[PDB]
Design a protein around this ligand. Structure first.
Ligand SMILES: CC(C)Oc1nc2nc([C@]34CO[C@](C)(C3)C4)cn2cc1C(=O)Nc1cccn(C2CC2)c1=O
Length: 286
């Protein structure tokens, strides 16, 4: 049900893959670990075009993205419109997300207004609903992070990047992911949906605090260490709450923090499963 583009077609609608950032006059919107994401236009639809960038491993991920996207349709997952396998360079074409990534909105990149606490609650709920869909359908995402949660015009959260996804224990020799988000067992090469939960907990800390998961010029460098600072009585969650908010109440903030803390159990089998995380976040706003 996806459309088969040709590489030249996606080229001409992206200003010939103009790699300059959008803010500077080009078409580059961002980049990840596996390619460059370009803004484009086909017919009357604005689209995002990921031009993928070992070469054998890249092709397998490209095929996995299509396979997963074909079987996984949900309002909290990004939508694939088509692809281009013509020639050597591979492209995936997605529905455009007018509010970009959660990572960029939490940092207010390019001058966007800070996200309200009410919007942050709806985003956390939506991202949990998307992870719940993946796990119900026996997919492990393996790369949950704020850069992989995109936002549409109503700030509905949409999980992206299923190149590394796996069916759902199991150890692997190729260890992939973003270290500042990964569970300890994922860092050791275990593949388990329990690791998706841990990474989501880090995302919840980003939502609460507005801080990046890792910052070289901050103490602590790693966000997940603040749970230890709070736990050993040195600090409180209120000391870290994003100050770029005036609609956050301590009761629901602490409720979200409680979920993140539960997700961030170092021991995998003490973590809640995604259905419980889903319920806890629903109980937050009731
Ligand atoms: C996050 C980047 C890579 O992407 C974007 N960035 C965007 N920024 C803005 C603006 C507008 O005004 C600002 C001030 C700039 C915020 C909009 N915006 C849309 C996208 C976008 O649609 N990206 C994706 C769509 C589908 C899937 N994927 C994953 C699969 C690769 C995407 O990355």
């Amino acid at each position: 049900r996806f459309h088969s583009f040709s590489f030249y077609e996606l080229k001409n609608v992206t200003n010939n893959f103009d790699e300059r950032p959008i803010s500077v006059g080009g078409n580059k919107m961002g980049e990840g670990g596996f390619g460059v994401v370009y803004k484009g236009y086909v017919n009357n639809t604005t689209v995002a075009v990921k031009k993928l960038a070992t070469t054998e491993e890249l092709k397998q991920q490209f095929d996995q993205e299509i396979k997963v996207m074909a079987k996984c349709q949900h309002e909290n997952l990004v939508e694939l419109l088509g692809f281009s396998s013509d020639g050597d360079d591979l492209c995936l074409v997605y529905v455009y997300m007018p509010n970009g990534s959660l990572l960029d909105r939490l940092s207010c990149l390019d001058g966007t207004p800070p996200l309200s606490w009410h919007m942050r609650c709806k985003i956390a709920q939506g991202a949990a609903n998307g992870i719940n869909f993946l796990h119900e359908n026996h997919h492990i995402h393996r790369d949950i992070k704020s850069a992989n949660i995109l936002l549409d015009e109503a700030f509905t959260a949409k999980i992206s990047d299923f190149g590394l996804a796996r069916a759902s224990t199991v150890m692997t020799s190729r260890i992939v992911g973003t270290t500042a988000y990964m569970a300890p067992e994922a860092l050791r090469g275990e593949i388990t949906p329990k690791s998706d939960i841990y990474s989501f907990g880090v995302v919840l800390l980003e939502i609460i605090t507005g801080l990046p998961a890792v910052d070289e010029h901050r103490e602590p460098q790693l966000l997940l260490d603040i749970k230890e600072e709070i736990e050993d009585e040195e600090k409180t969650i209120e000391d870290y709450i994003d100050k770029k908010m005036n609609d956050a109440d301590s009761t629901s903030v602490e409720a979200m923090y409680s979920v993140a803390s539960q997700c961030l159990h170092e021991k995998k089998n003490k973590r809640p499963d995604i259905k419980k995380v889903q319920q806890l976040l629903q109980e937050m706003t009731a």
